[PDB]
């Protein structure tokens, strides 16, 4: 009955210690979650930028149309006779 | 002696409880860590698709140019 007391003072020196660690895992978990909210947004950002690169492609797709239409009108006007 | 014994058995029954919650928070933290890794990638994905949307624009610019330089070689031939 010197160790019995010495160990109830060592026991709760440990249960303070393991609380403080549980505090920093919870605190953390929270911040973890505020990084996990960005991902829904970034997954969109991708798909916007994409759909845009597309709608830009479509523009460029169609322009080329005008461009044979021009080169072809200038194969027509070049042979004036 | 044997009254302090009653409370040093609750003290280590509390360490068991506390650890169990440690384990679960860690376990959990790792499932969320998997999703937090994709982040750095998606941030890149964005900034590839971007520089590319740009690249398409510069392809258009240079085409539409050709086309104006044609609608001046056809604007002359109007006799």
């Amino acid at each position: 009955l010197e160790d019995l007391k010495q160990q109830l003072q060592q026991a709760e020196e440990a249960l303070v210690a393991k609380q403080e660690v549980i505090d920093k895992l919870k605190e953390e978990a929270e911040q973890h979650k505020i990084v996990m909210e960005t991902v829904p947004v970034l997954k969109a950002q991708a798909d916007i930028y994409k759909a845009d690169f597309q709608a830009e492609r479509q523009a460029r797709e169609k322009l080329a149309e005008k461009k044979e239409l021009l080169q072809e009108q200038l194969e027509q006007l070049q042979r004036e006779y | 002696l044997e009254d302090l014994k009653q409370q040093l058995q609750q003290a280590e029954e509390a360490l068991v409880a506390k650890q169990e919650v440690i384990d679960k928070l860690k376990e959990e933290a790792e499932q969320h860590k998997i999703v937090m890794e994709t982040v750095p990638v998606l941030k890149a994905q964005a900034d590839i698709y971007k520089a590319d949307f740009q690249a398409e624009r510069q392809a258009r610019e240079k085409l539409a140019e050709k086309k104006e330089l044609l609608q001046e070689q056809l604007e002359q031939l109007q006799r």
């Binding site: 160790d3 160990q7 060592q10 026991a11 440990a14 393991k18 | 003290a11 280590e12 029954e13 360490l15 068991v16 650890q19 169990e20």
Partner: peptide
């Protein structure tokens, strides 16, 4: 004198935690 049923180390009965794991007696 007990073996922490995490890293199985012959630990002193005096110690409430592991000398390696910081892990309790009953788990």
């Amino acid at each position: 004198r007990w073996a922490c049923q995490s890293c199985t180390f012959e630990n002193e009965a005096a110690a409430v935690l592991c000398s390696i794991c910081e892990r309790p007696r009953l788990a």
